[PDB]
Ligand binder design. Structure first.
Ligand SMILES: C[C@H](C[C@@H]1CC[C@@H](O)[C@H](O)[C@H]1O)[C@@H]1CC[C@@H](C)/C=C/CC/C=C/C(=O)[C@H](C)[C@@H]2CC[C@@H](C)[C@@](O)(O2)C(=O)C(=O)N2CCCC[C@H]2C(=O)O1
Length: 128
């Protein structure tokens, strides 16, 4: 399925080249511009654990998830991955625990040492 495919066929987008964050572009976005550090980014996403269980979805809330890029407001894999996206892009990210919640996990849903799968749609990004 999709998690296996990004694991085996994804692009390492880490600066360290440690395969901690792998990406596949699923729907190509607009033009060439990607968000910059500090931009307000609007996304939709769903997340799955490696046991197949969905742990979250913004779609189910009928509102986007909003954060400021590159500020550690989200897990490292998201700051790294969303920074590579074009407006309108949909991607798959595979996030090893060192770029996610590590040994701590995130109670109640995310166990220790969890590799996470996300589908992310970059809806918009704005500075100012
Ligand atoms: C929980 C996490 C905490 C954050 C991690 C980085 C670290 O440097 C920060 O100190 C720490 O606060 C952060 C919240 C997003 C920041 C921006 C939100 C904080 C407000 C408090 C409530 C947040 C939520 O309910 C999240 C939507 C919820 C929390 C539990 C997670 C397992 C999850 O369901 O989100 C989830 O899907 C997830 O894993 N997220 C949300 C989407 C972005 C990626 C990821 C995430 O980084 O969420």
């Amino acid at each position: 399925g999709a998690p296996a495919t990004v694991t085996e066929q994804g692009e390492d987008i880490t600066s360290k080249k440690d395969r901690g964050v792998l990406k596949i572009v699923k729907r190509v976005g607009n033009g060439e511009e990607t968000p910059m550090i500090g931009d307000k980014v609007y996304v939709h996403y769903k997340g799955k654990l490696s046991n197949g269980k969905k742990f979250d979805s913004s779609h189910d809330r009928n509102e986007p998830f909003v954060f400021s890029l590159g500020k550690g407001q989200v897990i490292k894999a998201w700051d790294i991955g969303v920074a590579t996206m074009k407006k309108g892009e949909i991607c798959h990210l595979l996030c090893k625990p060192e770029y996610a919640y590590g040994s701590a996990g995130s109670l109640p849903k995310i166990p220790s040492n969890a590799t996470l799968f996300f589908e992310i749609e970059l809806l918009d990004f704005k500075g100012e």
